[PDB]
From a paper:
Following their assembly in the nucleus, pre-60S ribosomal subunits are exported to the cytoplasm where they are converted to translation-competent particles. Sequential maturation of the cytoplasmic pre-60S subunit couples dramatic conformational rearrangements of two long flexible helices (the L1 stalk and H38) to recruitment of the final ribosomal proteins (eL40 and uL16) and assembly factor displacement.
Focused classification of the local density around the P-stalk revealed that binding of ribosomal protein eL40 does not occur until state III, prior to the recruitment of uL16 in state IV. Thus, Yvh1 and eL40 do not appear to bind simultaneously to the same particle. An observed contact between Yvh1 and the side chain of uL6 K141 overlaps with the binding site for the N-terminus of eL40 in state III, raising the possibility that the recruitment of eL40 may destabilise Yvh1 to promote its departure from the pre-60S particle. The incorporation of eL40 (state III) stabilises H89 to form one face of the uL16-binding platform and may also facilitate Yvh1 release by disrupting its interaction with uL6. In states I-III, the L1 stalk is displaced inwards with H38 in the ‘closed’ position. Although focused classification of state III identified a subset of particles in which the Nmd3 eL31-like domain is rotated towards H89, this class lacks Lsg1 and Arx1, with Reh1 present in the PET.
Author numbering:
A (entry chain T): 2 to 160
B (entry chain a): 6 to 57
C (entry chain P): 8 to 276
D (entry chain E): 6 to 174
RNA sequence: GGUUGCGGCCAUAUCUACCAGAAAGCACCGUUUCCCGUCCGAUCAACUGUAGUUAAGCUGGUAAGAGCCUGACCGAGUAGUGUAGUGGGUGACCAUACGCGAAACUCAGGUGCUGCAAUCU
RNA sequence: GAGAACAGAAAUCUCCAGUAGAACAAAAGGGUAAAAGCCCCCUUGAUUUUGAUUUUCAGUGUGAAUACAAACCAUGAAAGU
RNA sequence: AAAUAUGUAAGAAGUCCUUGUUACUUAAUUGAACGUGGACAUUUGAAUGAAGAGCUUUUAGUGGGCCAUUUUUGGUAAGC
């Protein structure tokens, strides 16, 4: 009958990209992982030790433990009507950091700086981001671009 | 037979709530070598902040 | 070949096309326990050209590897050795030199003297108590094939004698008996100095004298016999222990004229 | 012309396909430690065929690779069995060749009637100084096409040497 | 700028064909007594840089080249697609409204960048 | 592909090309080239104590796996596994 | 290589500085984790809304389902 294995329905998930086959490059064995760091899970089928399950591919989680050649991550899984903390240990080859938080961190490093600037400057500066507000007035010249009149084109002789 | 109709409406009546993260999580799943030393570190910090 | 072949062709890495680096080895030598977070892992690169030796102490980062110390064999004339530089004794001396240099760069040359009376045993740098532990480096012998008697372990022995901790075993030094698993320190001490060259010097001085004059030419030009090697190398060890520092070469030019001369030759676009 | 371009002999391999393992195979191997001087090396089989009557991992045949001056001497005394009359077909496009003799005793070796009568297969390979770069471990690399051996180089070398009188057919 | 050792990204770095390489370096090359491993000192091991060479490797150059990378008033606001309608159509299927929006292709340009240490007329 | 007596479309030997078109006990899929394949050397981590975790899932069992710890061992020059 | 759908983050349990603990870790007075003591504490660092947030016990009925749009699988096809 039907099968529900640990690696079922994984033909395309755990295969390597085009012309990225073979050994894992070294920059990932030299990256450093501390507790609290935020990591996105992407596995590779070159390394069957420490693999995650196909649910946790593409998810994002928080480190909670650091061991030789492997780190533990916490992930919130939906089952039924609640979320569950899933603690899973992975080798590093299936792990890359998350730049999502790093962008926020440098935004903080900037807002602190310009707050420090504006305080001594005696001015107030808005640090809350804003969406794409509507556009504003403007005046469009007609010097080199006269309005080029168009028309709907016909069908005959196009076919 | 294995019709998922109404199951998500059932899930979404009492919401789907997050697991209430706390400060100081549990130290059961961590490296015991780390844990053993953490105990001693904190005990010494206590015996130092008690003296000062 | 066709076009599909060239499209679907994945290249290997650059230092695998060039045939210079084993990544199956590098992955193991370099990667560290994640619990030792930024702790570097120092390798002792030993490489042998046809007429040089390169000893390097190397750590690793993402922006390429990083060097802590270096010791080439084309500087030993500072200490006395002039001939036989791609040699077992030369390797020993070079290892001792990188050792004694690194350890004074750190601060441990007075705490870990290593050995000074040399008789050729298997002896590891034992860590002093209530004090700093030895500097720990790991040997990475490139693509050099390991064989008992090889040069590359000369530097290993020299380093472990020079003061720093290279974990190793004695089953690849010369003078190791396969049948009984036993080492011959007399033979190893004979190899540390020029014993295996001196016996050939003496055996060709009664067997093939034209070939003696051909090979060992500089020795005779500098008035050297087969007995003075055991004096030269021992006089050089003490000198290395004395001044292992790197006084660089006085440059003729300043890296601008050196480029001005080459810029006219390289057939620029 | 230049040095480091001469088509020196790299090695000479002698092959003897005995076909079947036994005292015949040992007769075959016995000649080689007296001809070349080195012990031979027996060659296991690779597949299973009954037209010739063998199976896998049988030591059916033997060979030996000789280098150095002795190779050129053996070649000199083996060429006189062919009377120094080689074809151009035996020559290969890589710049090497060989020939198969029927009688082994025509080289200079002592005869016995019990050993048997079996032939031999000579094959030389000759390459300029600088082909270590295909064989070493560190920094392997291919030689340049201006440095490769060709049929037209080696037949010229062979016409020059030995007073060949090749049969360009 | 050149070269070597270790490297990072791993084809802009690969493949094919021709040319040049001053200095040093690397390399090729020379020798089997010892350690050592070979059917063979060919590879590996050891000794000498001594006898010779840049011929090759290596690097840099060139090409209607293949390949790879990059970007487009290119294809194309096309194909496909989410939402709506007591919209059309016998149906296949289609049109419209609010929105998202490709690709192969075509065109143009490019053909390794760089880190640590040492060293070079 | 080019070559070597018997030698043949096919016995053994040699050179060039060869991104894997081979092999990895067995289904298919994934993966793998100084290897995870082919040969050789040494061995028994196919061991002890008990726990945490992932998968099927009620977050129960069974089964199989993952990552550490405390011991003892192997292997290797060592890193390490 | 889309569209739709999907994971995470968008700060006080935060940012910076200083120096304390440890039997872990380091060549090490190196780091790891936890801290003390100071600085920012206004827009507490996107929008919209919040009709209160969190937690716990216990227990009923149910565990025969059907129709439609759209996608789709066997089936000639069905109110299959």
């Amino acid at each position: 009958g039907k099968s529900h294995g640990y690696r079922s329905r994984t033909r395309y998930m755990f295969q390597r990209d085009f012309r990225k086959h073979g050994a894992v490059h070294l920059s990932t064995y030299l990256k450093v992982y501390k507790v609290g760091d935020i990591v996105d899970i992407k596995a590779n089928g070159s390394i069957q030790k420490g693999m995650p399950h196909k649910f946790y591919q593409g998810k994002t989680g928080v480190v909670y433990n650091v061991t030789k050649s492997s780190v533990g991550v916490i992930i919130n899984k939906m089952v039924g009507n609640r979320y569950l903390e899933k603690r899973l240990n992975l080798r590093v080859e299936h792990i890359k950091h998350s730049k999502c938080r790093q962008e926020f961190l440098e935004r903080v490093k900037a807002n602190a700086a310009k707050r420090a600037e504006a305080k001594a400057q005696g001015v107030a500066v808005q640090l809350k981001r804003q969406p794409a507000q509507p556009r504003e007035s403007r005046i469009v010249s007609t010097e080199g671009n006269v309005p080029q009149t168009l028309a709907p084109v016909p069908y005959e002789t196009f076919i | 037979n294995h019709t998922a109709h109404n199951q998500t409406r059932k899930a979404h009546r009492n919401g789907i709530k997050k697991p209430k993260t706390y400060k100081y999580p549990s130290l059961k799943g961590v490296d015991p070598k780390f844990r053993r030393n953490h105990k001693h570190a904190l005990h010494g910090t206590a015996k130092a902040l008690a003296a000062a | 070949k066709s076009s599909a072949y060239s499209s679907r062709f994945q290249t290997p890495f650059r230092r695998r096309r060039e045939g210079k680096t084993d990544y199956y080895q590098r992955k193991r030598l370099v990667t560290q326990h994640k619990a030792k977070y930024n702790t570097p892992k120092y390798r002792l690169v030993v490489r042998f050209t046809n007429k040089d030796i390169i000893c390097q102490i190397i750590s690793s980062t993402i922006t390429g590897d990083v060097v802590l110390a270096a010791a080439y064999s084309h500087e030993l004339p500072r200490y006395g050795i002039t001939h036989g530089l791609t040699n077992w004794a030369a390797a020993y001396a070079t290892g001792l030199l990188i050792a004694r240099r690194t350890l004074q760069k750190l601060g441990l040359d007075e705490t870990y003297k290593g050995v000074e009376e040399v008789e050729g045993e298997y002896e590891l740098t034992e860590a002093v108590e209530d004090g700093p532990r030895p500097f720990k480096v790991f040997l990475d012998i490139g693509l050099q094939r390991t064989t008992t008697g090889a040069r590359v372990f000369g530097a290993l022995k020299g380093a472990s004698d020079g003061g720093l901790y290279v974990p190793h075993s004695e089953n690849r030094f010369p003078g190791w008996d396969f049948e009984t698993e036993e080492i011959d320190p007399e033979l190893l001490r004979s190899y540390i100095f020029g014993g295996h060259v001196s016996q050939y010097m003496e055996e060709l001085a009664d067997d093939d004298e034209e070939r003696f004059s051909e090979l060992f030419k500089g020795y005779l030009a500098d008035d050297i016999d087969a007995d003075s090697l055991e004096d030269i190398y021992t006089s050089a060890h003490e000198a290395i222990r004395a001044d292992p520092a790197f006084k660089p070469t006085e440059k003729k030019f300043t890296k601008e004229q050196y480029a001005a001369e080459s810029k006219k030759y390289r057939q620029t676009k | 012309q230049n040095p480091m371009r001469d088509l020196k002999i790299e090695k000479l391999v002698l092959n003897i396909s005995v076909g079947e393992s036994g005292d015949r195979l040992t007769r075959a191997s016995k000649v080689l430690e007296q001809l070349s001087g080195q012990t031979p090396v027996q060659s296991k089989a690779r597949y299973t065929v009954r037209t010739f009557g063998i199976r896998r991992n049988e030591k059916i045949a033997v060979h030996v690779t000789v280098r150095g001056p002795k190779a050129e001497e053996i070649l000199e005394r083996g060429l006189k069995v062919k009377e120094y009359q080689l074809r151009d077909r035996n020559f290969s496009a890589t710049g090497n060749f060989g020939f198969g003799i029927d009688e082994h005793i025509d080289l200079g070796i002592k005869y016995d009637p019990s050993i048997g009568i079996f032939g031999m297969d000579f094959y030389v390979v000759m390459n300029r100084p600088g082909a270590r770069v295909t064989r070493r471990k560190r920094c392997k690399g291919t030689v340049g096409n201006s440095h490769k051996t060709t049929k037209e180089d080696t037949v010229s070398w062979f016409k020059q040497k030995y007073d060949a009188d090749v049969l360009d057919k």
